[PDB]
Amino acid sequence: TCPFYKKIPGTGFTVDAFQYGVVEGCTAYFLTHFHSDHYAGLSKHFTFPVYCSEITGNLLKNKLHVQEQYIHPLPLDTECIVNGVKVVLLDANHCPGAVMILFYLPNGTVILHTGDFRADPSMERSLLADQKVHMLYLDTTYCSPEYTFPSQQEVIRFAINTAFEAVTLNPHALVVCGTYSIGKEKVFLAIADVLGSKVGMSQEKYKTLQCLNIPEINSLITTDMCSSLVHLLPMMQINFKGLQSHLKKCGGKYNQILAFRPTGWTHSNKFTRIADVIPQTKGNISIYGIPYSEHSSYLEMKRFVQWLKPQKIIPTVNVGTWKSRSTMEKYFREWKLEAGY
Ligand code: NI
């Protein structure tokens, strides 16, 4: 049945709750972002109001064929009224179109639902600074101190420098990047820009990117694989067998592959700096796993919460085991005692 952490008290609202059939009492279904664990259940047969960003609404119409009459896009950073309740959508610094949601309850309570997010100090100067938040529905994906990772900027610098060196040494090397959802576009777009190529991809993936309001996108992507030396493939194909196969398909235009797998966290992070990352190599194929995250590190999460000072925290991630829930609750108390709230 729908879990409590997907319901907003004192309203008829749910968040990212599309796989439970008709949730009894629900007058408006909010969707924070277009990732499958969150939209699971939507289709052209859905006949309740969906509230989301413009970009998530483009994807709902074009990719899942949700009928337009049920899509309610809201602009960001703008006080809106939904079924008599003031709400605001904020940038979540996750994937394109991803938002957090501020609810202003008729009784005076204010609730923030982070959706999936990567906390940033820039959030401390949004409309969040303007009033107190009583309850926080928190993306706790990496809520444990082992989860450190570098800035997105440091990761993209490593990727750009590695790709540029490789192709300048061997003008017959092909660069391949994995994907299985929206998000992490900067990885392949940054590499294509430094090499003076467009990124080549499948028609399905091309259609998905054309829904994202990215500036000058017609200039950066293409479905003509022959004219491109950065190819995007399913993440499943980023292994030695899949890459050898793809190389055969290119008809001897290329004699080497340099491939990137943008993972979240991997336990090479506890020890290894970004400067010291190495690939796995077999023959003329090298694969780099790079720690490009769209979720908060532990420290980023902690800073956000200690700045916000909520009265109650409700985790939305890693809630399925008693040891995980108990561990998170211990961190929340440490943070509260250290900061004084
Ligand atoms: Ni997500």
Curated annotation (Swiss-Prot):
Cellular location(s): Nucleus
Induction behaviour: During mitosis. The mRNA encoding this protein contains an internal ribosome entry site (IRES) in its 5'-UTR. This 5'-UTR generally suppresses translation while specifically promoting expression during mitosis, when cap-dependent translation may be impaired.
Keywords (A to Z) from UniProt: Cell cycle, Cell division, DNA damage, DNA repair, Hydrolase, Isopeptide bond, Metal-binding, Mitosis, Nucleus, Phosphoprotein, Ubl conjugation, Zinc, Zinc-finger
Any single biological process term in GO: cell division
CC annotations in GO: fibrillar center; nucleoplasm
Tissue: Expressed in brain, heart, kidney, liver, pancreas, placenta and skeletal muscle.
Molecular function GO terms recorded: 5'-3' DNA exonuclease activity; beta-lactamase activity; damaged DNA binding; zinc ion binding
Keyword Nucleotide-binding: no
Keyword RNA-binding (UniProt): no
Protein family according to the UniProt entry: Belongs to the DNA repair metallo-beta-lactamase (DRMBL) family.
Function, in words: May be required for DNA interstrand cross-link repair. Also required for checkpoint mediated cell cycle arrest in early prophase in response to mitotic spindle poisons. Possesses beta-lactamase activity, catalyzing the hydrolysis of penicillin G and nitrocefin. Exhibits no activity towards other beta-lactam antibiotic classes including cephalosporins (cefotaxime) and carbapenems (imipenem).
Assembly behavior: Binds constitutively to TP53BP1. Binds CDC27, which is itself a component of the anaphase promoting complex (APC). Binds PIAS1.
Name of the protein described by the UniProt record: DNA cross-link repair 1A protein
